[PDB]
């Protein structure tokens, strides 16, 4: 038989802009940002990422380009 105070007034949120759960937990943000920045790393240079698979050599799985040199010219 009493008027309960609702959650907005119980914590005066107001008009703050909306954020994400990745932003709400500061560890997860630095997990998701790191995995994304690890993904970008494989797109510029290359990572070893294991040797030949257990199945054996199945060809250079993504293309061979002839006119491309990638050595650091001393």
């Amino acid at each position: 038989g009493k008027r309960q105070i609702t959650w907005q007034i119980q914590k005066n949120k107001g008009l703050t802009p909306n954020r994400k759960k990745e932003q709400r937990n500061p560890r997860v943000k630095k997990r998701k940002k790191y995995e994304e920045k690890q993904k970008k790393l494989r797109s510029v240079k290359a990572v070893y990422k294991g040797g030949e698979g257990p199945g054996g050599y199945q060809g250079e799985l993504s293309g061979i380009k002839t006119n491309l040199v990638k050595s650091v010219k001393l």
Partner: protein, 96 residues
Amino acid sequence: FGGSSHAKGIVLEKVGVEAKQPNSAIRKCVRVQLIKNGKKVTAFVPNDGCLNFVDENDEVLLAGFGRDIPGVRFKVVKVSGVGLLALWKEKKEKPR
């Protein structure tokens, strides 16, 4: 100003209340009167939606403006004892 960081003042007249474009600097500016000197200076309210909040003859606290009318030095930080950003965000009600 003076030797202090935040000076108090009275809102004398919201000059440029009848500007057309909403975020014009002449729209945002507010003429106030610093109490410690009895002086007349001009300060910026950070948004027109908060120029709606500032009322005439109110103890208005103002500070420096560090970064359309280049040279206005002061900006309004508090109104009647309440933080102005909180007023605009609708956190507290302005005590009059």
